């Protein structure tokens, strides 16, 4: 099972440069992104996927700014980055699902708006 440096919640203000939801796998064993699939979920909906085999990201229209930094994925960094305007209406539990060839894991982070 993939294990994570878990975080219960992160907060942001409109003074934040950008919204970053952390997801860090500590025992990642993939050696090329073709072996990797990343799914981000919110309120039961898939709001970001990265298909490493096809080098293809998919987002719904209400998360059009969401992205991950693919150069960091094999270090275990699947953190989701999005604009504040996409985040402010979607506070709550986010789920990060990371899948390799034979192993996978998921972790939950609550995004909060604070001031």
């Amino acid at each position, epitope marked *: 099972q993939l294990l994570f440096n878990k975080t219960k919640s992160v907060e942001f203000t409109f003074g934040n440069d950008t919204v970053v939801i952390p997801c860090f796998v500590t025992n990642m064993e993939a050696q090329n992104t073709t*072996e990797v*699939y990343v799914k981000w979920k919110f309120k039961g909906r898939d709001i970001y996927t990265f298909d*490493g*085999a096809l080098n293809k990201s998919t987002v719904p229209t209400d998360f059009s700014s969401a992205k991950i930094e693919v150069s960091q994925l094999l270090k275990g960094d699947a953190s989701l980055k999005m604009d504040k305007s996409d985040a402010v209406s979607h506070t709550g539990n986010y789920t990060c699902e990371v899948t*390799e060839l*034979t192993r*996978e894991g998921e972790t939950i982070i609550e995004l909060k708006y604070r001031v």
Partner: antibody
Amino acid sequence: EVKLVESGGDLVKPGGSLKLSCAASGFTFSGYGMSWVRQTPDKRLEWVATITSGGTYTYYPDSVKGRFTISRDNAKNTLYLQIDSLKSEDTAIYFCARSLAGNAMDYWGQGTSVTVSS
Amino acid sequence: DIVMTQSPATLSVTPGDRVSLSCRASQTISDYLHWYQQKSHESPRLLIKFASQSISGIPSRFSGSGSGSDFTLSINSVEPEDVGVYYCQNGHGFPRTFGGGTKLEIKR
């Protein structure tokens, strides 16, 4: 075109050893995980081994763990499966497959036949 | 020890039918489920990955759906050349396991 060609299948006696080979072409071999799947005479499929694209990590089901070894030579674009302490249940057609996340196997070879029998 | 169930084992259908094939997982695997077809005297080929993503070069009449524990491969307007065995495979859960296969037969 992606092409995978297995070889090395043969009739072998129980307790013997066998090394299967798979030559790969048509893609960047070193950029993909690889797997072996076998199909028994009842036509059921069983995954038996997977290796990451750099060769470092190997994965096996419990049925074969400890006596199958998967390996690869990325300079030679070749995949290997070494089978030790063979049992009659290892009689099957053995396929090499290119693998993706979740072990989705988007290209397969034609297979090589192994029969374990005295 | 995840178990993948395909029922029925054999399915006879009519050309032009919209056919649905079933796969059931002994545990939740979300949408991490793949579909293969193996025609007679061929090796399997990937039809659908992750429950519903089509594969390049596969005929457009194949599609997949479902999440969690129950999955469906659809063939809209099945053809005689579609005869063969269809296998599901979990993308989550260990080990990576194949269902027993559903053999598709064409009625004539």
